């Protein structure tokens, strides 16, 4: 009496992965390639739907990571390769209007550079930071990337502003947006909605802290695989952002040196006025309140009566031990020891020392660096902290106290805090069900 | 009365050419880029059908040749380019524990090379063979590629092992596999089968000897486009493999020279043992019985009572006169005059071998690759599964036939593997009359 009927277009999805395409409203990320995004993003709420999500097993973070790396490598291709810059550098210390904090940080180098004519050289000079040069034993110096890999110089016409990009699913696929509040990294979501494209995600590269990210809806959320594992990083999301102001009062000057036919090297000229160390300011009251909220959530996860102690980074490279910035064109490396220094039981601002490096390896890759050319004028970087990347130590059987230190070593954690609400599924329109619908000859 | 009917999905195919994607279970051929092969390759045996095959007119050979050339050119692009090496090389002979056969083959050159700094230069030493070194002033030598093209140093992390690759036809196309023995490569095949992918085709590069190939099923098979034509190479397939042991007991040492910022040049540092010439060992018993089977199959086509002689290569370049191949990474050029030296009527053979670093693969001009030296003793074992012979004419043939090895192009080497495959285009649309009238 029952015949298996065939239905097409049934609302059935299957968890899988695919190659998503970008959408935006030149930059390094080539948002000019991302297709346009309609001004009316469709968002249909799915009542009575309980879908299981997973932050760590999500494939969107890996795809976006590969896309960002590919866009960076493609953007550095039409620029100037700084291969003849690796020469013998005769550097001297810059003691003109220097401060006590900047003693030895900036070095005034002089070297023989090539000209447009292959039969003659030129005597030019430039200012390099201490982190960009190394002695080969005035003294003879050499860039730190000469013995590893000669890299290209970043094009000044191309900016590093992390404008948001929207990841959209192709035909036959859908993106499930979890609108449930107080939702951690895993577990089922009782409020799932569908969207054709994700929200505006800014590809901001940062270490130990999250900048210009998405804020929490109601309270501070602590996300990790499980708190029993110390090797897994702890992702924190703030509900109220705290303002952070980074700047450099040096007022640098850009000097153009034509090293060859059609290519030029943007060197650093003389410093205007006094030289002061780059710093960053964080409000003391807001940071204390945010640390109190984070301590409350960590106590809720680890049990009450725990002495939550915050410590600075343990050790390692400068990229994992310092906070990395990217705004205007100069890459910063700020010492965040003043923020993570407290102990919790039961107009003032924090000035953090900061350093600037020109030759960087932000993707933690050996053999492909990038030279950031200097920019003129005083840089004023104003942003807000929306999260942290903490790491807990062992602590042994002593559960009366726990030490939390900033973490890093993986850029995927920065984008994981933004893609926690999305998931890619495969729409399955074919379905079979019995009905009294039978064919007739 | 009969009315036409439309049938969709009929088993009808037509010969056509297509772009066959590969299939495979860090590498030059980029095996990681290929799709994963089927763990259970389905092979449907087609009964009562006879399909005409053509070994010499197969488009898969040309497609494979272009694919191997493209992969070879793409694999050399992400590593070091050796343009800075065309300089005056003050060289001299090695003469340290040489063995008379290697008197001037190895040379100890010295030259001025750049360093990590653009304005700093240095003097380094390197061991270069006489094959890739030419005198520029009649003690001052230079590389043979200095007046041809700047060679590209091969990537040291990328291996040259010919791992098998499977060629698969896309949707709407099929590969017909002829499972009939005694096939000479041309003509109809009374036993064909449909396969979605071919078997393991190892892209082994070899001249005058088919190494690591597919053996015959019953007896030695001899295939040629025209037996009576001397310009057509004769392809022989063995039913049993002939083991060959090639080695290099020099025990070279590899050192890295900072050719520039971020790039290093791998040069032969020094020898820490007795310098001996490379050689390959082939047992004369198996080679004798194999040549007996070959001469029997040759007499099967050229008639009885005629004598057949085997001579070495006539002359020309070293790539066509010597058996060139790859063994562990280093490129060998062995003299096979000892193998093809006999006359038929009615221990181990030690073949002298030479090693060259600057090579011009695929017989191209303007594109060369420098093979970096490999430390340690290189030894490999291969299977001689076939030969590429060449015949010459004479006045009334004088009841004699002379066969010499043929250093042809790489298409003939891969043709011995794709001899039982062809590509057909499926035509599912068909019409036939039936006593059926559609209603109105």
């Amino acid at each position, epitope marked *: 009496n029952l015949w298996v009927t065939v239905y097409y277009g049934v609302p059935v999805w299957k968890d899988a992965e695919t190659t998503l395409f970008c959408a935006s409203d030149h930059n390094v990320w080539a948002t000019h390639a991302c297709v346009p995004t309609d001004p009316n993003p469709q968002e249909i709420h799915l009542e009575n739907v309980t879908e299981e999500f997973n932050m760590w097993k999500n494939n969107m973070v890996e795809q976006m990571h590969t896309d960002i790396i590919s866009l960076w490598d493609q953007s550095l291709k039409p620029c100037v390769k700084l291969t003849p810059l690796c020469v013998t550098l005769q550097c001297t210390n810059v003691t003109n209007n220097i401060t006590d904090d900047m003693r030895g940080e900036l070095k005034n180098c002089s070297f023989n550079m090539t000209t447009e004519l292959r039969d003659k050289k030129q005597k030019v000079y430039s200012l390099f930071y201490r982190l960009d040069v190394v002695q080969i034993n005035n003294k003879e110096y050499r860039l730190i990337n000469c013995n590893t890999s000669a890299c290209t110089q970043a094009c000044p016409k191309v900016s590093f502003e992390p404008i948001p990009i929207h990841y959209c699913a192709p035909a036959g696929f859908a993106i499930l947006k979890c609108k449930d509040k107080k939702f951690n990294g895993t577990g089922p979501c009782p409020s799932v909605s569908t969207v054709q494209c994700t929200h505006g995600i800014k590809p901001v590269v940062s270490t130990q802290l999250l900048l210009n990210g998405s804020l929490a809806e109601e309270e501070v959320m602590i996300r990790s695989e499980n708190i029993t594992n110390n090797a897994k990083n702890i992702l924190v999301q703030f509900n109220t952002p705290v303002q952070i102001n980074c700047t450099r009062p040096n007022n640098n000057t850009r000097k153009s040196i034509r090293i060859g036919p059609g290519q030029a090297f943007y060197a650093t000229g003389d410093i205007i006025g006094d030289i002061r160390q780059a710093h960053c300011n964080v409000s003391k009251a807001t940071w204390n309140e945010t640390l109190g909220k984070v301590v409350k959530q960590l106590r809720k996860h680890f049990g009450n009566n725990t002495i939550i102690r915050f410590a600075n980074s343990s050790g390692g490279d400068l990229e994992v031990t310092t906070h990395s910035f990217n705004c205007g064109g100069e890459f910063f490396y700020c010492n965040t020891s003043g923020l993570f220094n407290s102990t919790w039981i039961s107009n003032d601002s924090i000035t953090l020392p900061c350093r600037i490096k020109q030759i960087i390896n932000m993707w933690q890759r050996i053999g492909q660096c990038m030279y950031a050319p200097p920019i003129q004028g005083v840089i004023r970087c104003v942003s807000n902290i929306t999260g942290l990347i903490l790491t807990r130590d062992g602590g042994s059987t002593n559960s009366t106290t726990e030490t939390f230190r900033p973490g890093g070593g993986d850029m995927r954690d920065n984008w994981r805090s933004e893609l926690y609400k999305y998931k890619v599924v495969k729409i399955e329109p074919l379905g079979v069900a019995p009905t009294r619908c039978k064919r007739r000859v | 009365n009969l009315w036409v009917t439309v049938y969709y999905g009929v088993p009808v195919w037509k010969d056509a050419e297509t772009t066959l994607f590969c299939a495979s279970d860090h590498n030059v051929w980029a095996t990681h880029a290929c799709v994963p092969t089927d763990p259970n390759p389905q092979e449907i045996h087609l009964e009562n059908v006879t399909e005409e095959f053509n070994m010499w007119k197969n488009n898969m050979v040309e497609q494979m040749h272009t694919d191997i050339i493209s992969l070879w050119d793409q694999s050399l692009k992400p590593c070091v380019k050796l343009t800075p090496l065309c300089v005056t090389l003050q060289c001299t002979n090695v003469t340290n524990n040489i063995t008379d056969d290697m008197r001037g083959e190895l040379k100890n050159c010295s030259f001025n090379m750049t360093t990590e700094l653009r*304005d*700093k230069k240095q003097k380094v030493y390197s061991l270069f063979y006489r094959l890739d070194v030419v005198q520029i002033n009649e003690k001052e030598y230079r590389l043979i590629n200095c007046n041809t093209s700047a060679c590209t140093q091969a990537c040291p992390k990328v291996s040259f092992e010919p791992i098998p690759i499977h060629y698969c036809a896309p949707a709407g196309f099929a590969i017909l596999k002829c499972k009939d023995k005694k096939f000479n490569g041309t003509g109809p095949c009374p036993s064909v089968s449909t396969v979605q992918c071919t078997h393991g085709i190892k892209p082994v590069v070899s001249t005058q000897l088919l190494l690591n190939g597919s053996l015959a099923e019953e007896e030695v098979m001899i295939r040629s486009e025209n037996i009576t034509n001397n310009a057509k190479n004769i392809l022989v397939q063995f039913n049993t493999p002939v083991q060959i042991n090639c080695t290099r007991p020099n025990n070279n040492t590899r050192k890295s020279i900072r050719i520039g910022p971020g790039q290093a040049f791998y040069a032969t540092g020094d020898i820490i043992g007795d310098i001996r010439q490379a050689h390959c060992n082939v047992s004369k018993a198996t080679w004798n019985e194999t040549l007996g089977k070959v001469v029997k199959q040759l007499r099967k086509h050229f008639g009885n009572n005629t004598i057949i002689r085997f001579a070495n290569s006539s002359g020309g370049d070293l790539e066509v006169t010597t058996h060139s191949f790859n063994c562990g990474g280093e490129f060998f050029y062995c003299n096979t005059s000892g193998l093809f030296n006999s006359t038929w009527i009615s221990d181990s053979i030690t073949l002298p071998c030479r090693i060259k670093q600057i090579i011009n693969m695929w017989q191209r001009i303007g594109q060369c690759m420098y093979a970096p030296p490999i430390q340690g003793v290189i030894r490999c074992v291969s299977n001689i599964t076939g030969l590429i012979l060449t015949r010459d004419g004479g006045s009334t043939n004088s009841t004699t036939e002379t066969f010499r090895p043929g250093g042809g192009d790489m298409r003939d080497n891969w043709r011995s593997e794709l001899y039982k495959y062809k590509v057909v285009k499926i035509e599912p649309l068909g019409v036939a009359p039936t006593r059926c009238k559609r209603r109105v």
Partner: antibody
Amino acid sequence: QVQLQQWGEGLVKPSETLSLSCAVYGGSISGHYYWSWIRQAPGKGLEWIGKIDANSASTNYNPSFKNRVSISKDTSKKQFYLNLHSVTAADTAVYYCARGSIYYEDDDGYYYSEATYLHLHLWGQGVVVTVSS
Amino acid sequence: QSVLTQPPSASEAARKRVSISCSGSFSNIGTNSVSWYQHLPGTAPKLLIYHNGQRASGVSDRFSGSKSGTSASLAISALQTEDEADYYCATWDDMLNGYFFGAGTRL
């Protein structure tokens, strides 16, 4: 311009360690230079002993003084020393501490810093030694 | 007996030209520069010719040096009375990793 003076023991008994000290005045222990020691016996020619790099701690010695000579460098007080263990009666020679420039500039804009262009420009005043009772 | 073969002595009158030869191997002369030194009894040796063709500071125009592959030579044009000294040819040996002086040509 640059003066080099050396001092040591004029009479040394057989079988102990012979120590020689040479100092630099007007210059510095830095740059592309090779601080070497050269001695010559009466009736024999100049014989090289060893060397020490100015910008590195590496050193090389003559094979005739296999595992018998040692040369140290102290860049703090700009001095380099020479030590010869188990002095025999064949060591009576006038020891000279010399500086060997290894810098060379070709016709182009390149430069070389290696032992290929080694040449001893300056020499010490020379100190004689006697190996007897 | 040793590297850097040089004749034990040379005798020639004044006002004319004399040549002192010095030959070695490929590792010492063929790939490294040859240096000439002059030594008098009682004083320290002095550098005469360096880089096979460059004259040291304070050296008269009469001294001249040249190198031809494996062999090297020192030319003394218009010999004088105070030229009676010991001339040593030195170069670096890449095979033995060390500086080696000649046998010493007594003029």
